Structure formats: structure tokens, C-alpha cells
């Protein structure tokens, strides 16, 4: 159906269905154990992302690949009952849609995961070259296969070149992988999302150091963001003020899985209502927080 | 008198091949992912068919898209369908199995779902005239005894060409299904339940078990890669030899191959010996393939 023009948030990424099962002990390779529960969710960054926003209340739409099959039908469903907007699925004709499957032990907290298997092609630069962007107000990209992202970053970045200042298309990128290849999605869009982790693996030891050492390879004008976890998040813009906001943790944690793609949806979505960056940074705490004493995604709002 | 129904569980396997199987509180990445068909009398009608055998399935379901996959594979494979228990209360199970690459070792963490079991009223319900054989996985044993009497109480007033034949399954290692060695004229023993008992192999197990089934009836137990036995009221004990594949992909279901195999070829007349032989012939071929495509 009919999307007003400027109107949605797009991320690009991978969707995935997670298979949780919480067992007493540790299975013994070759043999039968009734685990305690179990559960799908769909999962991945991107797909996370656009729960987050819907429930924000962000008209969403999620582009990635997926094969025609089963597991993409719970994966459709799931989107659908989380209200975002599938129109822009690479439907891919080989390949599996991935899914993983997540075994918790519950005498220790261990978690053991057998990933998705690298099957399924990737939404590609020619893939992306189709999308009429037009409906698009902000296009979060989840760092994947860079060299093709970085032609669908120049793509939007051509499109805003013969855009009036508000009907420009505001972009968003995320580093979240210690992979080199990510590196180069630094000197793309408005806002540059980079884990803790990849910081930790390039050697900085906190969200200033991660923010002050990468600084230099963003695009003029890009602001850097880095969530820290329990110790908050930081900002850096062009005017070179370190900006920080506190965790807002809950009063008795329950589940932190998805809890970063709650702050960058967050974050999105403030700067997307014209919020600062301070406020969006506080915002994106907030939420997080909120999530990390929820079970999934309900009641974030 | 034309088709063999099998009585018990199915489930929605979520199969991940990996290269090695994963250390605990690891990060691997699989090779390949599939859905399949599982449960034991469920992977036995799929061999069934395969086997050219007409067979039904009597089970426990709940309506929803996990049934909506079984029920579409069930019906692919031509497995009559008709007598599914359908539950208003439950989600159908579901698991998770790792089949590790280099030796086809299958590793299940199983999701029962707590959907209520195949009652003896729901089996009341059954016509039991189109079936020659009924195998029956043991579950609800108390229920199932039931279900026993009433084949034992409809083939007294059977002349014995109109006889139908009973076999059981007793794979879990739970002292209550240990009263279901005294039904059915075929009774299957796992390798499993035998070592429970402290039985150290096939032979061990159904010299241990045998005062404990039906008179005339044939105690069976297969022992993986090294073969199986087969015991009846003669007391000569039968052994067959395993058919390994010189590469061993995929493990999970071997048993269930085994055990439809046997019965299979038991309704076509041919002996135990003939029977065990077959049994571990397409289990064998079962085990260096991905799935039960192609074990015929
Ligand atoms: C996004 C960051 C901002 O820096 C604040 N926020 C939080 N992240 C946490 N984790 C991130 C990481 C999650 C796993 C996953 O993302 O899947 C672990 C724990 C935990 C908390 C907590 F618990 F303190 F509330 C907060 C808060 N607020
Ligand atoms: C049924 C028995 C007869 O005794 C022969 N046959 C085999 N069972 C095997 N397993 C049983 C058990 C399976 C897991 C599962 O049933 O889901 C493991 C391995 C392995 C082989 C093998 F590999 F050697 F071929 C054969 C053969 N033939």
C-alpha cells in the first residue's frame, strides 16, 4: 500500500530466527535431553531495530534477504506482528534463511551458539539500486558486506546532492562486527554507531578514547556515537564537545539481548524528531535501560 | 486389513550440520540448515512409504504452523493423516539436533511442548479394520495398556488371517513403560533402555527380558553399529550384522529405520532372521544419507 513520501525509517541488515533453549546441563554429544523451555524470536540488528521503532511509534521498513521457505514465513509473521514494513525483502532464490540455535545452561548462564550458516547472498548494491528511496525520511545500514553498502551509500548521498535541506534523507551507519572490511563504512553517513566491542578490538578502552581515537575517520559533519553498556553511551559531533549520558539500568536485569539495537533505534528515531544529540543520546539510554529489565521487546514504551 | 498405523510422537526437527560438535559456552557457524519431519513413529511412516508400505499416523497435534509444516511433509510422503488427535491445549514440539559432519552423531535438545497424549478414549474412536499392523511408541503407557487390550479384545473375534499384528516400542529408560513388554507380538528394546537395566549388550538384554513379553511374541534390540537380535519362543537367539556406509553423514532416525524396516518386511511373510537383516540393511543406507530420501 501507499507510504507517504519522507515518512519511514529503513534499516538494512540481517534477520534471523533464534532458537533459545534453556537446559539443565549441557547436552553429551549423541544423545536425547528435554530442555526446560524454549523459544523462537527473530533476531539480527537490523530486524531488532525496526521492532524498536515500530513500538516508538516510526513507520519502519526492514530490507534484507531472506529465501522463500518456512523459516521465512515465521520471520514475515513476526515483522507483520511487530507492524514493520516488508516491501523491500531480497528474496533470494539459493540459500537458507538464517537461523541459529542458542543453548543456555541454566547451572551456569553459559550460552552455546551454533550461528546461521553463510548460505544466503546479501542484499547487493544492484539490489538496493531498485529502491525508490522516496518514502525513506532515515537509512540505517547495519555494517555487512561493505564494499557493496558503500555504493548504496553513495546512491543516497547522489539522491540528497538534488534534494531541497528537508526532503534530504538523514543516514545512519553501524560498525558492530571486529571485521577490517567495516572500517571503511566510517566515512559514511550523519551518525556512525560503533560497539563497544570493535572499539575494545582496536585497543581503546572506553567510549572517549574509542570516540577521540576514530573521530578523524568519519565524514565532515558526522556525529560518532559509542554505547559503553552499563557505564552509558557518548557522542562526538563536529563541534568536538565529548557528549555522555548514564545508563538508566533496571531495578533487577531479566533480559539484555537486543538491548544495543534498542539504543540505536532510539537514537534514530529521537534525531529523527528533531531532538539533539544530547537528548537522543539520553533517550537511547532510557529506552535500553527499560529493555534490559524486559523480557523481549514489550512494554519498552 | 491394507495399512500399518504407527502410534506416538511428532516433531518439528531444527537440524544444523556442523564440521565438529561445539565445545560448551562456544561460537560456531554451522554448514547447513534444514527442517524436518521427526518424532520415532512419525520418522517410521516416512520410511514406511518410501518402503511402499500404505501406512497411517495416530498422534497428538496442535492447530498452527508448525502442524501446518508436519502435516504438508506427512502428507508429501502419502502418510494417512486422518487419525491425528488434534489438541485445543499445547503448541506442537519442536527441537533442536546437531548432526555433527565427520561421524553423523545426532545430538537432540527436545521441546515437549506438554500437549496431552493419545488417549485410550481417542483411540476407542479408531476403526481398526483397515490396518494389518499397529505399532504403538511407548509414552503413555497406563493409556497405552488400554489401547492393547482393545487390539487383543478385537483380534479374538478374528479368525488368524484377519489377525492384526501389534508391535511396541520401548525406547525411553521409564519404569512405567517397562508393562508394555508384556504386549504385542514384535517388542523393539532400546540399546538405551537394555544399558538402563545393566544389560551390556543385545544378547545380555533379551536373554534378561524375554520372561517379560507375551507368549509367542518376538523381543527385539538393535545395538547401533553392532548389529541386531532378535529372540522368540524357539529360544534360539538371532543376530544380524550392522550395514555401515563407509561414511557416516547422518544418524538421526537410524532406529526408527530399523524398526519400520523390520515390521515392513515381517507383513511381507518373510522370517526374523530375513526381517533383523533388512532392518539393519536400510538403517545402514539411512546413516550415509542426509535425511530418508533415497534409502530405497
Ligand atoms: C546500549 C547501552 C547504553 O550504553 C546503555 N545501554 C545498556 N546496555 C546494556 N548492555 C548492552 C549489551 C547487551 C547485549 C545486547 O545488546 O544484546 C549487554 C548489556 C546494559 C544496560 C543496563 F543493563 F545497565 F541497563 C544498559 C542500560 N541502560
Ligand atoms: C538400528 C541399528 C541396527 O543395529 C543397525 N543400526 C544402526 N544404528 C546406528 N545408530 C543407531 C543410533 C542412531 C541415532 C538415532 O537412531 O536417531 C545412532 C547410531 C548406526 C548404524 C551405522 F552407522 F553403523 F550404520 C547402524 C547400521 N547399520
Not at 3 to 16: A, D, E, F, M, T
Amino acid at each position: 500500500g501507499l507510504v507517504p513520501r519522507g515518512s519511514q525509517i529503513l534499516c538494512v541488515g540481517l534477520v534471523v530466527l533464534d532458537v533459545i533453549s534453556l537446559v539443565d546441563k549441557y547436552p553429551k554429544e549423541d544423545s536425547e535431553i528435554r530442555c526446560l523451555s524454549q523459544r523462537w524470536q527473530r533476531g539480527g540488528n537490523a530486524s531488532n531495530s525496526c521492532t524498536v521503532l515500530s513500538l516508538l511509534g516510526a513507520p519502519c521498513a526492514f530490507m534484507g534477504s531472506m529465501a522463500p521457505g518456512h523459516v521465512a514465513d515465521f520471520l514475515v509473521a513476526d515483522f507483520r506482528r511487530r507492524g514493520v514494513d516488508v516491501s523491500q525483502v531480497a528474496w533470494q532464490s539459493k540459500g537458507d534463511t538464517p537461523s541459529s540455535c542458542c543453548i543456555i545452561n541454566n547451572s551456569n548462564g553459559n550460552r552455546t551458539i551454533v550461528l546461521h550458516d553463510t548460505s544466503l547472498p546479501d542484499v547487493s548494491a544492484t539490489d538496493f539500486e531498485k529502491v525508490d528511496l522516496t518514502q525513506f525520511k532515515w537509512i540505517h545500514i547495519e555494517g555487512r558486506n561493505a564494499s557493496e553498502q558503500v555504493k548504496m551509500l553513495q546512491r543516497i548521498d547522489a539522491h540528497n546532492t538534488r534534494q531541497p535541506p528537508e526532503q534530504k534523507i538523514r543516514v545512519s551507519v553501524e560498525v558492530e562486527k571486529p571485521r577490517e572490511e567495516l572500517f571503511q563504512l566510517f566515512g559514511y553517513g550523519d551518525v556512525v554507531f560503533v560497539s563497544k566491542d570493535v572499539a575494545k578490538h582496536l585497543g581503546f578502552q572506553s567510549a572517549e578514547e574509542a570516540l577521540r581515537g576514530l573521530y578523524g575517520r568519519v565524514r565532515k559533519g558526522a556525529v560518532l556515537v559509542c554505547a559503553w553498556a552499563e557505564e552509558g553511551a557518548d557522542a562526538l559531533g563536529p563541534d568536538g564537545k565529548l557528549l555522555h549520558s548514564d545508563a538508566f539500568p533496571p531495578p533487577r536485569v531479566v533480559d539484555t539481548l537486543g538491548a544495543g539495537d534498542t539504543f540505536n533505534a532510539s537514537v534514530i528515531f529521537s534525531l529523527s524528531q528533531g531532538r539533539s544529540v544530547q537528548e537522543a543520546l539520553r533517550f537511547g539510554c532510557q529506552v535500553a535501560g527499560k529493555k534490559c529489565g524486559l523480557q523481549g521487546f514489550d512494554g519498552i514504551v
